[PDB]
């Protein structure tokens, strides 16, 4: 009977950087997904492996909500099969993803005059992430053949870079808050059902 605490996800006061993307588990509650889907507040609402209109008819074992901030022209990377700096090095969906990707422009909160630099992404990595892998390491990245000896220098980079969100950026460079819902089915009773 108790409603899932989606407010705590979508209306969180702080959002993680994408390299350090945040996961919240949702269980033992009733989920009204149609109110989410019909909400005008979302620039993006795309589902994979499920119909958005039919989600209220389904029961899952658990639901996971992953949330973070990226720039607008990167929202397309939060989808199965995609590549780029975010899909490759920060947050990776599997080909067989069952869930929904939800995003909205947060320029009013996440940009500031002079630039908001609080949000970071991983610019360099020795290999691509596996699906749902999370890398919060900060080893110096060796882009060339010479050693770094643990410090930045010639072809040796700190692996994270800050987004510089300024209010006057074009939309492709504006901040977007993103929530990825994953629907999990285990060999157990369902605990997250529609109304």
């Amino acid at each position: 009977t108790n409603l899932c605490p989606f407010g705590e996800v979508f209306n969180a006061t702080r959002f993680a950087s994408v390299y350090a993307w945040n996961r919240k588990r949702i269980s033992n509650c009733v989920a009204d997904y149609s109110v989410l889907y019909n909400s005008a507040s979302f620039s993006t609402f795309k589902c994979y492996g499920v119909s958005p209109t039919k989600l209220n008819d389904l029961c899952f074992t658990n639901v996971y909500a992953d949330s973070f901030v990226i720039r607008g022209d990167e929202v397309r990377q939060i989808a199965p099969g995609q590549t780029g700096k975010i899909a490759d090095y920060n947050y990776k969906l599997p080909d067989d993803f069952t869930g929904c990707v939800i995003a909205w422009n947060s320029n009013n909160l996440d940009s500031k005059v002079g630039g908001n630099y609080n949000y970071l992404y991983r610019l360099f990595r020795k290999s691509n992430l596996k699906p749902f892998e999370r890398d919060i390491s900060t080893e110096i990245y060796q882009a060339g053949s010479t050693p770094c000896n643990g410090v930045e220098g010639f072809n040796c980079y700190f692996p994270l870079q800050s987004y510089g969100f300024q209010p006057t950026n074009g939309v492709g460079y504006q901040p977007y808050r993103v929530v990825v819902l994953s629907f999990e089915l285990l060999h157990a009773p369902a605990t997250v059902c529609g109304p």
Partner: antibody
Amino acid sequence: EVQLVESGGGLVQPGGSLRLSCAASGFTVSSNYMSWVRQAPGKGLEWVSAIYSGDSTYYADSVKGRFTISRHNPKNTLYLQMNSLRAEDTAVYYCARLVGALTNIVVSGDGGAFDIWGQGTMVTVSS
Amino acid sequence: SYELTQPASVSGSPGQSITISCTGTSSDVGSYNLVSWYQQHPGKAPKLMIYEVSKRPSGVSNRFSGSKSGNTASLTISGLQAEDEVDYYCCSYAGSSTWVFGGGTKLTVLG
């Protein structure tokens, strides 16, 4: 239309200080490795200092502890702050772009060379 | 200060080849494939001719070639032209994000 233009050179007394500037056009110092290289009159090139990502700085032992390399991105300018100047620091000072592995004119490999140079600014340390 | 060692002067006749050497140590030339060469006209900034031992920047004549053996790098100039009568410098990575130039060579084109 890539260009580097040094300024700030002049006459300084031994022990004095002087700040050189290097204005870039056509590209951004913030996204490139940069260096200062100097040349005493009639003599050879001497690498002075470099700056890489994260404003990580490195210096020749001949100037270490006395010189500081820095960037100001809004002005798209590289600086060299020179303190405790010696007569042996007299030279034309050039700013240059140091190609690296991620430079756009590198197809593969590590770069490791100075391809864009300013015209130089003359520094004379004398009493 | 520590520098790579180049002959002060070399001479060659037009149409012939000339080589300029650049001797460092096991910890610079001998450790990395990061040797570059520069041409310098009087009063002008150096021009990059060779990098990563043997690569030429776009637009640089294939008359210029670079190589290395042990602690010594070499620039070879073929089809010598009056235009070549300038100074040449080598440069190498010297480890831990530092660089070291050679002392320079004045090339004379005879004939």
